[PDB]
Structure formats: C-alpha cells, structure tokens
C-alpha cells in the first residue's frame, strides 16, 4: 500500500510492541490484575496489527 | 508512587495516546475495519491507563 498505509501499519507494530514493553514493566511491579489487563491489550493490539498486515501489508 | 510505578502510568498513558493517534491516522485512510478495532484498541488501553491510575495514583 501507500506510504501513509505503511505509517499505519508501523504504527500499529509498534503499539503491539510497547504492550510487551509494559507488561514486564507491570510483571515486576508484581501488579497483576493491570499485567492481566494489559495481556489482553496486547492480544487487542496483534489483532489489529494482523489486520492492518492484511490489509496495507 | 515510586519511579516504576511512575514509568508505568506514563507508559500506559503513552499507549493510550500512540492508539488515540493511530484511530486518527486510520480515519483519515479510510480504513474502516482497522479503524473500528483501533477504537476498540483505544478503549481497552484507557481501560488500562485507568486501572493503573486507580491502583497506584
């Protein structure tokens, strides 16, 4: 896709990223229903991605 | 609240604007389908900036 669609798609990566970046962060804090929340957030973040891949990939 | 904690919230903060951010892009992409599970994704990363927030302060 476009540029602007590759921006999006980098985005997105990056987000899905980040999530796995808190939740260790969320893991040593020994917070665990905010380490769980944040699990999901990353599943959320993969579908998303996974969707954008398909789509501007 | 400690420095992790601190590094933490604004982590989760930061993952709820890059997602408030995205939306944005993929609005003005057109994207439907992505934008529709980005606003999803957004939601489900307030949940998580809000959760940290009422856990640590």
Redesign the interface.
């Known amino acids: 896709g476009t540029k602007?669609?590759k921006?999006?798609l980098n985005?997105?990566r990056?987000?899905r990223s980040?999530?796995l970046?808190?939740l260790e962060?969320?893991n040593?804090?020994d917070?665990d229903?905010?380490a769980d929340?944040?699990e999901?957030?990353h599943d959320?973040?993969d579908?998303?991605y996974r969707?954008?891949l398909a789509?501007?990939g």
């Open positions: 602007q669609e921006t999006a985005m997105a990056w987000i980040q999530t970046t808190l962060k969320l040593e804090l917070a229903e905010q929340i944040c999901s957030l959320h973040a579908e998303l969707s954008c789509r501007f």
